[PDB]
Amino acid sequence: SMSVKKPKRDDSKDLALCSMILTEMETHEDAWPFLLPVNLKLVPGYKKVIKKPMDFSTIREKLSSGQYPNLETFALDVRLVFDNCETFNEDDSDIGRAGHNMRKYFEKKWTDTFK
């Protein structure tokens, strides 16, 4: 509360460390469904159904331009990419499986880097 603060967690490396995670997600062999925004002209149903599209290239641009206020807003966008994927793709599809695999990969890196 006023003039009463928990000890200051060092967040000075968060930007660099989120960048490194995002690099590792970008280079994973199963990243291909997530590298670029879904083409809303060419994928029937996506625009109406998926209210907040997100992809790795959009996260990279947001990260690089100071549009993440903190490491949690960064994780929220990464998770959004996988939540969108689960919303639109059957679990038993190449893209559906890709999304599960990447979410697992992310969550481990996240825990190991920050928890």
UniProtKB/Swiss-Prot annotation:
Expressed at varying levels in several tissues, whereas a smaller transcript was expressed specifically in testis. Residues 9-113 form the Bromo domain. It is found in: Nucleus. It comes from the Eukaryota. Belongs to the WAL family. Regulatory subunit of the ATP-dependent BRF-1 and BRF-5 ISWI chromatin remodeling complexes, which form ordered nucleosome arrays on chromatin and facilitate access to DNA during DNA-templated processes such as DNA replication, transcription, and repair. Both complexes regulate the spacing of nucleosomes along the chromatin and have the ability to slide mononucleosomes to the center of a DNA template. The BRF-1 ISWI chromatin remodeling complex has a lower ATP hydrolysis rate than the BRF-5 ISWI chromatin remodeling complex. Component of the BRF-1 ISWI chromatin remodeling complex, at least composed of SMARCA1 and BAZ2B, which regulates the spacing of histone octamers on the DNA template to facilitate access to DNA. Within the BRF-1 ISWI chromatin remodeling complex interacts with SMARCA1; the interaction is direct. Component of the BRF-5 ISWI chromatin remodeling complex, at least composed of SMARCA5/SNF2H and BAZ2B, which regulates the spacing of histone octamers on the DNA template to facilitate access to DNA. This is Bromodomain adjacent to zinc finger domain protein 2B. It comes from Homo sapiens (Human).
